[PDB]
From Swiss-Prot, chain B:
Disruption phenotype: CRISPR-mediated knockout results in loss of sperm motility and fibrous sheath abnormalities with asymmetrical distribution of flagellar proteins in a majority of sperm. Nearly half of the knockout mice develop enlarged heads and hydrocephaly. This is Axonemal dynein light intermediate polypeptide 1. The chain holds residues 208 to 253 of 258 of the full protein. It comes from Mus musculus (Mouse). Belongs to the inner dynein arm light chain family. Signal peptide: none annotated. Involved in sperm flagellum assembly. Predominantly expressed in the testis, also detected at lower levels in several tissues expressing cilia. Strongly expressed in elongating spermatid cells (at protein level).
Curated annotation (Swiss-Prot), chain C:
The chain holds residues 741 to 911 of 4250 of the full protein. Consists of at least two heavy chains and a number of intermediate and light chains. It is found in: Cytoplasm, Cytoskeleton, Cilium axoneme; Cell projection, Cilium, Flagellum. Belongs to the dynein heavy chain family. Disruption phenotype: Mice are viable and show no malformations; however, homozygous males are infertile, due to inability of spermatozoa to move from the uterus into the oviduct. Spermatozoa show decreased motility. In addition, tracheal beating frequency is reduced. The gene is Dnah1. This is Dynein axonemal heavy chain 1.
Amino acid sequence: NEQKAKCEATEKRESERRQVEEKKHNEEIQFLKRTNQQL
Amino acid sequence: NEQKAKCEATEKRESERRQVEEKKHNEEIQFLKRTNQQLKAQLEGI
Amino acid sequence: ELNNNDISTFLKTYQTQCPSAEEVREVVITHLKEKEILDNSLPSSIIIGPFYINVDNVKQSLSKKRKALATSMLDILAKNLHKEVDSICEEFRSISEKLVFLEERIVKVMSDYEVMDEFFYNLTTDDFNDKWAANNWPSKILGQIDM
């Protein structure tokens, strides 16, 4: 039971990290998008 | 078997996550290529 | 204090100070690093004794306030650039070496903003078109000088 809960906690932790990186990627893209379109 | 399948679920979740990250990274590099086209448009102005 | 000392207070204080635009950028990038500091330091949620606490609303409010401040400093720096570009174009119109020094001014401030952030630069389509027109203006100036 505890090892299952730990594995769940690990995949939750990684999916959180993935979201943080997703939003970094999104704003980085938005920077390129705005500068490219502004020409 | 559930617990092994669960840590394997973490492993294949990683596999699909980082391969997704890698293809969206390839898309981001293609957006850098669009920024090279942006440079080409700037010089087309110059 | 970062919440209460709102965008208006610092924006007015800075822009009446009207510091040197590159040093203004250097503080706005310090505030962007303050965004990064917040985003690393602040949790989403924390557990305290019998309590479950969430801090998302402060995390986002502080970070987006910092963004609004940095971008409004960039905006007034862009307006000061526009003031220079307008004086430069007004000189090109009026005489149509000082004109070349005004080319140097526009090129210099554009290059400064480019250097201090590529994303800060290209501030308006008007800035791109004024840069190209500022290149075109010397040809007109020389044509009229023939007179």
